[PDB]
Coordinates of C-alpha atoms in Angstrom, one line a residue:
Chain A
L1 CA -91.2 22.4 116.1
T2 CA -94.7 22.6 114.5
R3 CA -95.9 25.9 113.0
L4 CA -99.7 25.6 113.1
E5 CA -101.7 28.4 111.3
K6 CA -105.0 28.9 109.6
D7 CA -105.1 27.8 105.9
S8 CA -101.5 26.7 106.6
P9 CA -100.6 22.9 106.3
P10 CA -98.5 21.7 109.4
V11 CA -94.8 22.5 108.9
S12 CA -92.9 20.2 111.4
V13 CA -89.2 19.4 111.6
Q14 CA -86.4 18.3 114.0
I15 CA -83.4 20.3 115.3
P16 CA -81.0 17.6 116.7
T17 CA -78.5 19.4 119.0
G18 CA -76.7 16.2 120.1
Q19 CA -74.4 16.5 117.1
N20 CA -73.3 20.1 117.7
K21 CA -71.0 21.8 120.3
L22 CA -73.7 23.2 122.6
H23 CA -75.9 20.2 123.3
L24 CA -79.4 20.6 124.6
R25 CA -78.3 19.5 128.1
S26 CA -75.4 21.8 128.3
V27 CA -77.7 24.9 128.2
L28 CA -80.2 23.3 130.7
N29 CA -77.3 22.5 133.1
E30 CA -75.7 25.9 132.7
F31 CA -79.0 27.5 133.7
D32 CA -79.0 25.4 136.9
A33 CA -75.4 26.2 137.6
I34 CA -76.1 29.9 137.3
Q35 CA -79.1 29.5 139.6
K36 CA -77.0 27.8 142.3
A37 CA -74.3 30.5 141.9
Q38 CA -76.9 33.2 142.5
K39 CA -78.3 31.4 145.5
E40 CA -74.8 31.1 146.9
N41 CA -73.8 34.7 146.3
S42 CA -77.1 35.9 147.8
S43 CA -75.5 35.8 151.3
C44 CA -72.2 37.6 150.7
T45 CA -71.4 40.8 152.7
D46 CA -68.3 42.2 150.9
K47 CA -69.5 44.6 148.2
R48 CA -66.4 43.7 146.1
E49 CA -67.2 40.0 146.2
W50 CA -71.0 40.3 145.7
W51 CA -70.7 42.7 142.7
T52 CA -68.0 40.5 141.1
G53 CA -70.4 37.5 141.2
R54 CA -73.3 39.5 139.7
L55 CA -71.2 40.8 136.9
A56 CA -69.8 37.3 136.3
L57 CA -73.3 35.8 136.1
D58 CA -74.8 38.4 133.8
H59 CA -72.2 37.6 131.1
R60 CA -72.9 33.9 131.3
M61 CA -76.7 34.5 131.0
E62 CA -76.0 36.8 128.0
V63 CA -73.9 34.0 126.5
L64 CA -76.7 31.5 127.0
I65 CA -79.5 33.6 125.5
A66 CA -77.5 33.7 122.2
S67 CA -76.6 30.0 122.4
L68 CA -80.3 29.2 121.8
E69 CA -80.3 31.3 118.6
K70 CA -76.8 30.3 117.5
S71 CA -76.8 26.5 118.3
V72 CA -80.3 24.9 119.0
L73 CA -82.9 26.6 116.6
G74 CA -80.2 26.9 113.9
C75 CA -81.6 27.4 110.4
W76 CA -85.2 27.4 111.7
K77 CA -85.8 30.8 113.2
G78 CA -87.8 31.8 110.2
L79 CA -90.4 29.2 111.2
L80 CA -90.7 31.2 114.4
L81 CA -90.5 34.7 112.8
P82 CA -93.9 35.7 111.2
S83 CA -93.9 33.8 107.9
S84 CA -94.3 36.0 104.7
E85 CA -98.0 35.5 103.6
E86 CA -97.2 37.8 100.7
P87 CA -97.4 36.3 97.2
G88 CA -93.6 36.3 97.1
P89 CA -92.6 32.8 98.4
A90 CA -94.6 31.2 95.6
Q91 CA -91.9 31.9 93.0
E92 CA -89.7 29.3 94.7
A93 CA -92.1 27.2 96.7
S94 CA -92.0 25.1 93.6
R95 CA -88.8 26.4 92.0
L96 CA -86.6 24.9 94.7
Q97 CA -88.2 21.5 94.5
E98 CA -87.6 20.6 90.8
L99 CA -83.9 20.7 91.4
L100 CA -83.6 20.0 95.2
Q101 CA -85.5 16.7 94.8
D102 CA -83.3 15.9 91.9
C103 CA -80.1 16.6 93.9
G104 CA -81.2 14.2 96.7
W105 CA -84.2 15.4 98.6
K106 CA -86.1 12.5 100.1
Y107 CA -89.3 14.0 101.3
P108 CA -90.0 17.2 99.2
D109 CA -92.1 19.3 101.4
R110 CA -93.4 22.6 100.0
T111 CA -94.1 24.9 103.1
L112 CA -90.5 25.2 104.3
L113 CA -89.9 27.4 101.3
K114 CA -92.7 29.9 102.2
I115 CA -92.3 30.0 106.0
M116 CA -88.9 31.7 105.7
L117 CA -89.2 34.4 103.0
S118 CA -90.2 37.1 105.5
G119 CA -87.2 39.3 106.3
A120 CA -85.3 37.9 103.3
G121 CA -82.6 40.5 103.9
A122 CA -82.3 39.2 107.5
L123 CA -81.6 35.7 106.1
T124 CA -77.9 35.1 106.3
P125 CA -75.6 33.2 104.0
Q126 CA -74.6 30.7 106.7
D127 CA -78.2 30.2 107.5
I128 CA -78.7 29.5 103.8
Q129 CA -75.9 27.0 103.8
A130 CA -77.6 24.8 106.4
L131 CA -81.0 25.4 104.8
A132 CA -79.5 24.1 101.6
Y133 CA -77.4 21.1 102.8
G134 CA -80.3 19.8 104.9
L135 CA -82.9 20.4 102.2
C136 CA -80.5 19.0 99.5
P137 CA -78.4 16.0 100.3
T138 CA -76.0 14.0 98.0
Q139 CA -74.4 16.1 95.2
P140 CA -72.5 18.9 97.1
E141 CA -72.4 21.5 94.4
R142 CA -76.0 22.2 93.4
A143 CA -77.2 21.3 97.0
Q144 CA -76.0 24.6 98.3
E145 CA -75.3 26.7 95.1
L146 CA -78.9 26.7 93.9
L147 CA -80.5 27.5 97.2
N148 CA -77.9 30.2 97.9
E149 CA -78.3 31.9 94.6
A150 CA -82.1 31.7 94.7
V151 CA -82.3 33.2 98.2
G152 CA -79.7 35.8 97.3
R153 CA -81.8 36.9 94.3
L154 CA -84.7 37.2 96.8
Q155 CA -83.2 39.7 99.3
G156 CA -84.7 42.8 101.0
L157 CA -88.0 41.8 99.3
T158 CA -90.7 43.0 101.7
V159 CA -91.7 44.2 105.2
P160 CA -93.4 42.1 107.9
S161 CA -96.9 42.5 109.2
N162 CA -98.2 42.1 112.7
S163 CA -98.9 38.6 113.9
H164 CA -98.9 37.8 117.6
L165 CA -97.0 34.6 118.7
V166 CA -98.0 32.2 121.4
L167 CA -95.0 29.9 121.8
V168 CA -95.6 26.6 123.7
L169 CA -92.7 25.0 125.6
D170 CA -92.4 21.7 127.4
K171 CA -91.7 20.9 131.1
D172 CA -87.9 21.5 130.8
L173 CA -87.8 24.2 128.0
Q174 CA -90.0 26.6 129.9
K175 CA -87.3 27.9 132.2
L176 CA -84.8 28.9 129.5
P177 CA -85.4 32.6 128.5
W178 CA -86.8 32.2 125.0
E179 CA -88.1 35.7 124.8
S180 CA -84.8 37.7 124.5
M181 CA -83.6 35.4 121.7
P182 CA -82.1 38.0 119.2
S183 CA -84.8 37.2 116.7
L184 CA -87.9 37.5 118.9
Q185 CA -87.1 40.9 120.4
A186 CA -89.4 43.2 118.4
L187 CA -92.3 40.8 117.9
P188 CA -95.0 40.3 120.5
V189 CA -94.3 36.9 122.1
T190 CA -96.3 35.1 124.9
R191 CA -96.6 31.6 126.2
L192 CA -99.7 29.5 126.6
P193 CA -99.9 26.0 128.3
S194 CA -101.4 24.3 125.2
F195 CA -103.5 24.7 122.0
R196 CA -107.0 23.9 123.4
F197 CA -106.4 26.8 125.8
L198 CA -105.8 29.0 122.7
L199 CA -109.1 28.0 121.2
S200 CA -111.1 28.1 124.5
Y201 CA -109.8 31.6 124.6
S202 CA -111.8 32.3 121.4
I203 CA -114.9 30.5 122.7
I204 CA -114.9 32.7 125.9
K205 CA -114.0 35.7 123.7
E206 CA -117.1 35.1 121.5
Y207 CA -119.6 34.4 124.3
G208 CA -119.2 37.9 125.9
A209 CA -116.7 36.6 128.5
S210 CA -113.2 37.7 129.6
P211 CA -114.0 41.4 129.3
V212 CA -110.3 42.4 129.2
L213 CA -109.9 40.8 125.7
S214 CA -113.1 42.6 124.6
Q215 CA -112.7 46.2 125.8
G216 CA -109.2 46.5 127.3
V217 CA -107.4 47.1 130.6
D218 CA -109.0 50.1 132.2
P219 CA -106.2 52.3 133.6
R220 CA -108.3 53.0 136.7
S221 CA -109.0 49.3 137.7
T222 CA -105.7 48.2 139.2
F223 CA -105.0 46.7 142.7
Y224 CA -101.6 46.5 144.3
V225 CA -100.2 44.6 147.2
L226 CA -96.9 46.2 148.3
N227 CA -94.7 45.0 151.2
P228 CA -97.1 42.5 152.8
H229 CA -94.4 42.0 155.5
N230 CA -92.2 44.8 156.8
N231 CA -89.0 43.4 155.3
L232 CA -88.2 45.4 152.1
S233 CA -87.7 49.1 153.0
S234 CA -86.2 50.0 149.6
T235 CA -89.3 48.9 147.8
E236 CA -91.8 50.8 149.9
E237 CA -89.4 53.8 149.8
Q238 CA -89.4 53.8 146.0
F239 CA -93.0 52.9 145.2
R240 CA -95.1 54.8 147.8
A241 CA -96.4 58.0 146.1
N242 CA -96.2 56.5 142.6
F243 CA -98.5 53.6 143.6
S244 CA -100.7 55.9 145.8
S245 CA -101.1 59.0 143.5
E246 CA -102.1 56.7 140.6
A247 CA -105.7 57.8 139.7
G248 CA -108.4 55.2 140.8
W249 CA -106.1 52.7 142.4
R250 CA -106.4 50.9 145.8
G251 CA -104.1 48.5 147.7
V252 CA -102.4 47.5 150.9
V253 CA -98.9 48.5 152.2
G254 CA -97.3 47.2 155.3
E255 CA -100.1 44.9 156.5
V256 CA -100.8 41.5 155.1
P257 CA -104.1 41.8 153.1
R258 CA -107.1 39.8 154.3
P259 CA -108.3 37.0 152.0
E260 CA -111.6 38.7 151.1
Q261 CA -109.7 41.8 149.8
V262 CA -107.3 39.9 147.5
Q263 CA -110.0 37.7 145.9
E264 CA -112.0 40.9 145.2
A265 CA -108.9 42.4 143.3
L266 CA -108.5 39.5 140.8
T267 CA -112.3 39.4 140.3
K268 CA -113.6 43.0 140.4
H269 CA -110.6 45.0 139.0
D270 CA -108.4 44.5 135.8
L271 CA -104.8 44.6 136.9
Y272 CA -102.8 43.2 139.9
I273 CA -99.3 44.6 140.5
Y274 CA -97.6 42.6 143.2
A275 CA -94.4 43.9 144.8
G276 CA -93.0 41.5 147.4
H277 CA -91.7 38.0 148.1
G278 CA -92.7 35.2 145.7
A279 CA -96.2 35.5 144.2
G280 CA -98.0 35.9 147.6
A281 CA -98.7 32.2 147.9
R282 CA -99.1 33.2 151.6
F283 CA -102.1 35.6 151.2
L284 CA -103.6 34.0 148.0
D285 CA -103.0 30.3 147.1
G286 CA -103.9 28.8 143.8
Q287 CA -106.8 27.2 145.6
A288 CA -108.6 30.5 146.2
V289 CA -107.7 31.7 142.7
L290 CA -109.2 28.6 141.0
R291 CA -112.4 29.2 143.0
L292 CA -113.0 32.5 141.3
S293 CA -112.9 33.8 137.7
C294 CA -109.9 36.0 136.8
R295 CA -110.8 39.4 135.1
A296 CA -107.5 41.1 135.7
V297 CA -104.0 40.8 134.0
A298 CA -101.5 39.5 136.6
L299 CA -98.2 41.6 136.8
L300 CA -96.6 39.7 139.6
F301 CA -93.0 41.0 140.2
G302 CA -91.4 38.7 142.7
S303 CA -88.8 35.9 142.6
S304 CA -89.8 32.8 140.5
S305 CA -93.4 34.3 140.3
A306 CA -94.0 32.6 137.0
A307 CA -91.7 29.6 137.4
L308 CA -93.2 26.1 137.0
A309 CA -91.0 24.2 139.4
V310 CA -90.1 20.8 137.9
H311 CA -89.9 18.8 141.2
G312 CA -88.8 15.6 139.4
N313 CA -90.2 13.9 136.3
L314 CA -93.5 15.6 137.1
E315 CA -94.7 18.6 135.1
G316 CA -94.7 22.2 136.2
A317 CA -96.5 23.7 139.2
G318 CA -97.1 27.2 140.2
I319 CA -99.6 30.1 140.5
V320 CA -99.6 30.9 136.8
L321 CA -101.1 27.5 135.9
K322 CA -104.0 28.4 138.1
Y323 CA -104.4 32.0 137.0
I324 CA -104.7 30.8 133.4
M325 CA -107.4 28.3 134.4
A326 CA -109.3 31.2 136.0
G327 CA -109.4 33.1 132.7
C328 CA -106.5 35.4 133.2
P329 CA -105.7 37.2 129.9
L330 CA -101.9 37.7 130.5
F331 CA -99.5 36.8 133.3
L332 CA -96.2 38.6 133.8
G333 CA -93.9 37.0 136.3
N334 CA -90.2 36.5 136.9
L335 CA -88.7 33.1 136.0
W336 CA -85.7 33.1 138.4
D337 CA -84.8 34.9 141.6
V338 CA -84.3 38.7 141.6
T339 CA -83.0 41.3 143.9
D340 CA -84.7 44.6 144.9
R341 CA -83.3 47.5 143.0
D342 CA -83.1 45.9 139.5
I343 CA -86.6 44.5 139.6
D344 CA -87.8 47.8 141.0
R345 CA -86.2 49.5 138.0
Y346 CA -87.9 47.0 135.7
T347 CA -91.3 47.5 137.3
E348 CA -91.0 51.3 137.2
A349 CA -89.9 51.3 133.6
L350 CA -92.7 48.9 132.4
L351 CA -95.5 50.8 134.3
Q352 CA -94.5 54.3 133.1
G353 CA -94.0 52.9 129.5
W354 CA -97.4 51.2 129.4
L355 CA -99.5 53.6 131.4
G356 CA -98.0 56.7 129.7
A357 CA -98.3 55.4 126.1
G358 CA -102.0 55.9 125.9
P359 CA -105.1 54.1 124.8
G360 CA -104.5 51.0 122.7
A361 CA -101.0 50.1 123.8
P362 CA -99.7 46.5 123.7
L363 CA -98.2 45.3 126.9
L364 CA -95.7 43.0 125.2
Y365 CA -94.1 46.0 123.3
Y366 CA -93.4 48.0 126.5
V367 CA -92.1 44.8 128.3
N368 CA -89.6 44.3 125.4
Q369 CA -88.6 47.9 126.1
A370 CA -88.5 47.6 129.9
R371 CA -86.1 44.7 129.6
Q372 CA -83.3 47.3 129.2
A373 CA -83.9 49.1 132.5
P374 CA -82.2 46.6 134.9
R375 CA -78.5 47.2 135.4
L376 CA -77.7 43.5 134.8
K377 CA -79.7 43.4 131.6
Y378 CA -79.6 39.6 131.4
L379 CA -80.0 38.3 134.9
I380 CA -82.8 40.6 136.2
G381 CA -83.7 42.0 132.8
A382 CA -84.6 38.8 130.9
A383 CA -86.6 37.2 133.8
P384 CA -90.2 38.6 133.1
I385 CA -92.2 36.3 130.9
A386 CA -95.8 36.5 129.8
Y387 CA -98.5 33.8 129.9
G388 CA -101.6 34.1 127.8
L389 CA -103.1 36.2 125.0
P390 CA -102.2 39.8 124.1
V391 CA -103.6 42.5 126.3
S392 CA -103.8 46.3 125.8
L393 CA -105.6 49.4 126.9
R394 CA -108.9 50.6 125.4
Chain B
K1 CA -52.2 29.7 90.4
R2 CA -48.8 29.4 88.9
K3 CA -46.9 32.3 90.6
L4 CA -44.6 33.0 87.6
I5 CA -44.8 36.8 88.1
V6 CA -45.1 37.0 84.3
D7 CA -45.9 40.6 83.4
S8 CA -46.3 42.2 79.9
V9 CA -43.9 45.0 80.8
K10 CA -40.4 43.6 80.2
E11 CA -39.0 46.8 78.5
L12 CA -39.2 50.6 78.8
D13 CA -40.9 53.3 76.7
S14 CA -38.5 55.6 74.8
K15 CA -40.7 58.5 76.0
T16 CA -40.0 57.4 79.6
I17 CA -36.3 57.0 78.7
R18 CA -36.0 60.5 77.4
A19 CA -38.1 61.8 80.4
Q20 CA -35.5 60.2 82.8
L21 CA -32.7 61.6 80.6
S22 CA -34.0 65.1 80.9
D23 CA -35.6 65.3 84.4
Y24 CA -32.6 64.4 86.6
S25 CA -33.8 66.9 89.2
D26 CA -35.7 64.2 91.2
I27 CA -32.7 61.8 92.0
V28 CA -30.3 64.5 93.3
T29 CA -30.6 66.1 96.8
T30 CA -29.2 69.0 98.8
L31 CA -26.3 69.0 101.2
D32 CA -26.5 67.8 104.9
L33 CA -24.1 70.1 106.8
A34 CA -22.6 69.4 110.2
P35 CA -22.7 72.0 113.1
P36 CA -21.5 75.3 111.7
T37 CA -20.3 76.7 115.1
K38 CA -18.9 75.3 118.4
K39 CA -22.0 76.1 120.4
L40 CA -24.1 74.0 118.1
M41 CA -21.5 71.2 118.2
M42 CA -21.9 71.3 122.1
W43 CA -25.7 71.3 121.9
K44 CA -25.5 68.3 119.6
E45 CA -23.3 66.6 122.2
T46 CA -25.6 67.4 125.2
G47 CA -28.9 68.1 123.5
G48 CA -29.9 64.5 123.4
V49 CA -32.6 63.8 126.0
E50 CA -30.6 61.0 127.6
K51 CA -27.9 63.5 128.5
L52 CA -30.6 66.2 129.3
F53 CA -31.9 63.9 132.0
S54 CA -28.5 62.9 133.3
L55 CA -26.7 66.2 133.7
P56 CA -27.1 69.3 135.8
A57 CA -28.8 72.4 134.4
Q58 CA -26.2 74.8 135.8
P59 CA -23.0 73.4 134.4
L60 CA -20.8 71.9 137.0
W61 CA -17.3 71.0 135.7
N62 CA -15.6 69.3 138.7
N63 CA -16.3 65.5 138.9
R64 CA -16.7 65.9 142.6
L65 CA -19.8 68.2 142.2
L66 CA -21.0 66.1 139.2
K67 CA -21.0 63.1 141.5
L68 CA -22.8 65.2 144.2
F69 CA -25.6 65.7 141.7
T70 CA -25.7 62.4 139.8
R71 CA -25.6 60.2 142.8
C72 CA -29.2 61.5 143.4
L73 CA -30.2 59.9 140.0
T74 CA -31.8 56.7 141.1
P75 CA -32.9 53.8 138.8
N76 CA -58.3 44.0 140.0
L77 CA -61.0 46.7 139.7
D78 CA -61.0 46.3 143.6
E79 CA -60.5 50.1 144.0
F80 CA -63.3 50.7 141.4
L81 CA -65.6 48.2 143.1
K82 CA -65.3 50.4 146.2
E83 CA -67.4 53.1 144.5
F84 CA -70.1 50.5 143.7
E85 CA -73.3 50.5 146.0
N86 CA -73.8 48.2 148.9
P87 CA -75.3 44.7 148.1
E88 CA -79.0 44.3 147.8
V89 CA -81.4 41.7 149.4
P90 CA -83.3 38.9 147.6
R91 CA -87.1 38.9 147.0
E92 CA -87.6 35.3 148.3
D93 CA -89.0 34.3 151.8
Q94 CA -86.3 31.7 152.5
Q95 CA -88.5 30.3 155.3
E96 CA -114.8 21.2 149.2
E97 CA -116.9 21.5 152.3
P98 CA -119.2 18.5 152.6
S99 CA -122.7 19.4 151.8
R100 CA -125.9 19.0 153.9
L101 CA -127.8 16.1 152.5
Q102 CA -131.6 16.2 153.0
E103 CA -132.5 14.1 156.0
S104 CA -134.1 10.7 155.2
Chain C
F1 CA -52.3 59.3 124.8
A2 CA -54.3 56.1 124.5
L3 CA -51.5 54.5 122.3
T4 CA -48.9 55.4 125.0
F5 CA -50.8 53.2 127.5
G6 CA -49.8 50.0 125.6
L7 CA -51.5 46.7 126.8
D8 CA -48.7 45.4 129.0
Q9 CA -51.7 44.1 131.1
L10 CA -49.4 44.8 134.1
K11 CA -52.3 46.4 136.0
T12 CA -52.9 48.6 132.9
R13 CA -56.5 47.5 133.4
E14 CA -56.8 49.5 136.7
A15 CA -55.1 52.6 135.1
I16 CA -57.5 52.7 132.1
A17 CA -60.5 51.8 134.3
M18 CA -59.7 54.6 136.8
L19 CA -59.2 56.8 133.7
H20 CA -62.7 56.1 132.4
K21 CA -64.1 56.5 136.0
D22 CA -62.6 60.1 136.1
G23 CA -64.1 60.7 132.6
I24 CA -67.6 59.6 133.7
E25 CA -67.5 61.6 136.9
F26 CA -66.4 64.7 135.0
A27 CA -69.0 64.2 132.3
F28 CA -71.9 63.9 134.8
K29 CA -70.5 66.6 137.2
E30 CA -72.7 69.7 136.6
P31 CA -76.4 69.2 135.7
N32 CA -77.8 71.6 133.1
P33 CA -79.6 74.7 134.4
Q34 CA -82.3 74.7 131.6
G35 CA -83.8 71.5 132.8
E36 CA -83.2 67.9 133.8
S37 CA -85.3 66.8 130.8
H38 CA -82.2 67.9 128.7
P39 CA -78.7 66.3 128.4
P40 CA -76.2 66.6 131.3
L41 CA -73.5 69.3 130.8
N42 CA -70.0 68.4 129.6
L43 CA -71.4 65.2 127.9
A44 CA -69.7 65.7 124.5
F45 CA -66.5 64.7 126.4
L46 CA -67.6 61.1 126.3
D47 CA -66.8 61.3 122.6
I48 CA -63.2 61.9 123.5
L49 CA -63.3 59.3 126.2
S50 CA -64.3 56.8 123.4
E51 CA -60.6 56.6 122.2
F52 CA -59.6 54.8 125.5
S53 CA -62.4 52.2 125.2
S54 CA -60.4 49.7 123.2
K55 CA -57.8 49.5 126.0
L56 CA -60.2 47.8 128.4
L57 CA -61.2 44.2 127.7
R58 CA -64.7 42.8 127.8
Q59 CA -65.2 42.4 131.6
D60 CA -64.0 45.9 132.3
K61 CA -66.1 47.3 129.5
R62 CA -69.2 45.7 131.2
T63 CA -68.1 47.1 134.6
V64 CA -67.7 50.6 133.2
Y65 CA -71.1 50.3 131.6
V66 CA -72.7 49.4 134.9
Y67 CA -71.0 52.4 136.5
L68 CA -72.3 54.4 133.5
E69 CA -75.8 53.3 134.5
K70 CA -75.2 55.1 137.9
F71 CA -75.7 58.4 136.1
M72 CA -77.7 57.6 132.9
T73 CA -81.2 56.5 134.0
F74 CA -83.4 54.4 131.6
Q75 CA -85.4 57.4 130.3
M76 CA -82.1 59.1 129.3
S77 CA -80.9 55.8 127.7
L78 CA -84.0 55.7 125.4
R79 CA -83.7 59.4 124.7
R80 CA -82.5 59.5 121.1
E81 CA -81.8 63.2 120.0
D82 CA -78.9 65.0 118.2
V83 CA -77.8 66.6 121.6
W84 CA -77.4 63.0 122.9
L85 CA -75.2 61.8 119.9
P86 CA -72.0 61.6 122.1
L87 CA -73.8 59.5 124.7
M88 CA -75.0 57.1 122.0
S89 CA -71.4 57.0 120.7
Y90 CA -69.9 56.2 124.1
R91 CA -72.5 53.5 124.7
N92 CA -71.7 51.9 121.4
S93 CA -68.0 52.1 122.2
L94 CA -68.5 50.2 125.5
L95 CA -70.7 47.5 123.8

């Protein structure tokens, strides 16, 4: 884990999970087990059998999302939570070195004592115990006692500011839901492919490009593709007037849109709501998307719409990694497969929440809110992830 | 943590001693009397609910009729999941141009 | 009346589940005339229904919550007012 920030020296550490109870492969194998269970249950007729399976998988996904916070990150969620740039960590950023190094510290770093002070009340005594034992080896008394009393003395110190977060994950850690982690719920969290992307975003943002990040998402510049094939009657039934009455919107329902039309949407308008199967890799492939510049935030609500399929040792692959190369500001797509009604509830919740809030409304905030709309709030509620930089209205 | 139960109080106050000597109205009690009449004796015999649920309401004295009455004294979530809605359906299908070089 | 139904676990799960079902269906029985932007009638009952929550175990609590979603609706879930205090209490009971 490396927390890179301006005027902030690199703070990097390890979090070995091979010595704990929930090893880093247990979670990544339970995810696949739940996915296979869902694929198997997808073809059950008995309502009693089907509903039993859904309610037995939601609990397992809820267990998993908390495992990440309870076992893997451990005493290092403060390095993810906005660090306190207030002049309050300084009182200990050198106080807990002159004794910790004496008690056994080998490499006495100085930033690990400032990246955690934010939400000092939220810091827990058992968190403090690990933070102390690891920072202070050898003599068992002072090792914890000093760190614990010092952190206790600094409790309920201050309030946190606003600082958007762009977590970057590898080829295998991208599929675990890292957004619902019970520490990253309130904060705005997205996910970019790398760091050079983050800075090229600033280059484009300074040379009068990517107009969405300059002005905002115009609420009259949205294009929708609902029910390209006549298969999902429940969807069309729900989103017909709502997607039609919307002021200044245009789209296609029933018929498969022609290639010219869909390219125009991502290039001319600012928002692309997809309601259907997959990501529409049948009517718009990454090849057409790379051959245009993306000026519209992608809200693609279909199964595995933002899932980078790891087909072996190779890295991820999907439509998202080709919207981002076109200059897409944000990309909201589901990570695993979803059913109709739950994802329809999510889509309706997010849209009304974001398009009713008003001018200057962060999208990430209303997503964090729409996560509680699906009935199974962990199997079709924790699926939507975001790729890119924060977007909002004007 | 020697559990010696050692306590400073190993005596009694003379004030408390005289208080006990005078206030003997907290250790005495009243009189528990038994049924004062026959009807109440009967109702204590048969008023117990075990007898209330094993005897006729209209009193029958002959054992024949008592037998006639007392022989009549004898000794998951599946239904909830019925109310749930029908199963849903999944949202998965389950199914450069070469340029014209200038002629030589 | 909740103490009477001791946890013999001999299908006591179905009895207490069908008990909550009846409570939910009675709570969301008659919509309010004033408007559907206001709480459903007979919703304060859920506060009484809370005493029976402990009898269910975790799985039945989740199932009764999903059946509660059959009458709640997200907008009503996020609606935090004094007239909704009993619904908040019931939800916290089932969590």
